Amino acid sequence: SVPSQKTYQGSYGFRLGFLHSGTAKSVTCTYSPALNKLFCQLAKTCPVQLWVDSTPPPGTRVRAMAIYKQSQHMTEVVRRCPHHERCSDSDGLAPPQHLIRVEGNLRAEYLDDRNTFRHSVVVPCEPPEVGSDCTTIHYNYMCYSSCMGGMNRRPILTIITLEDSSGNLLGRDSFEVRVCACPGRDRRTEEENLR
Ligand SMILES: CN(C)CCn1cc(-c2ccc(F)cc2)c(-n2cccc2)n1
Numbered sequence: 001s002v003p004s005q006k007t008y009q010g011s012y013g014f015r016l017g018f019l020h021s022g023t024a025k026s027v028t029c030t031y032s033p034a035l036n037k038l039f040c041q042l043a044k045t046c047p048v049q050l051w052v053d054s055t056p057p058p059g060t061r062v063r064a065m066a067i068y069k070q071s072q073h074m075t076e077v078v079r080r081c082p083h084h085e086r087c088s089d090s091d092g093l094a095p096p097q098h099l100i101r102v103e104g105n106l107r108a109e110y111l112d113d114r115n116t117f118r119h120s121v122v123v124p125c126e127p128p129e130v131g132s133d134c135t136t137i138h139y140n141y142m143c144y145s146s147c148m149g150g151m152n153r154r155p156i157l158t159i160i161t162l163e164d165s166s167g168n169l170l171g172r173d174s175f176e177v178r179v180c181a182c183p184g185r186d187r188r189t190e191e192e193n194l195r
């Protein structure tokens with residue numbers, strides 16, 4: 001009833017990477033290594049790098065899923081709030097209920113799990129562009145952490161899994177996410193609080 005969040009590099013040495021975007025007031029997406037936490041604005045591009053030591057087989061896929069970080073909420077499906085699920089902002093592929101979208105990939109598939117009811121979005125693994133050392137996926141988060149009747153100020157984690165063609169686990173990584181109006185300020189504040 002709860003997806004594992006255990007970091008697992010697996011046989012291919014799978015792990016995530018994030019850009020270094022800084023904490024200026026104007027920043028739209030920024031990652032804190034000290035907090036393992038991504039801060040982003042609503043519906044803005046979040047670049048996430050996929051790193052491997054060796055190339056996985058054809059048919060390998062990468063899935064993203066959100067869960068609540070606090071144990072007492074972890075069995076609750078993370079979904080868009082009653083306002084955002086009804087705002088008709090679909091890209092024609094993502095169901096309006098899904099928090100996490102993949103941007104600019106027509107091969108993205110959205111799953112409503114028939115047993116757990118959890119949402120996820122999965123894309124085929126593709127080779128890096130010539131000249132690049134990793135592949136990047138662009139995610140969007142479609143509700144604020146503060147949305148009432150949705151996340152309602154509760155922190156979430158995104159779990160990224162590398163899967164074979166049957167959906168079996170090959171690798172796993174994860175990060176906390178806060179979707180907020182001013183990611184730069186919030187990252188600075190939370191990093192100061194930690195210190
Ligand atoms: C070590 N270097 C060479 C890795 C380059 N790379 C190939 C794939 C790759 C290429 C084709 C395919 F079918 C599956 C993975 C991939 N990758 C990993 C996650 C998502 C893409 N990275």
Ligand SMILES: [Zn+2]
Binds near residue numbers: 082142144147150
């Ligand atoms: Zn919302």
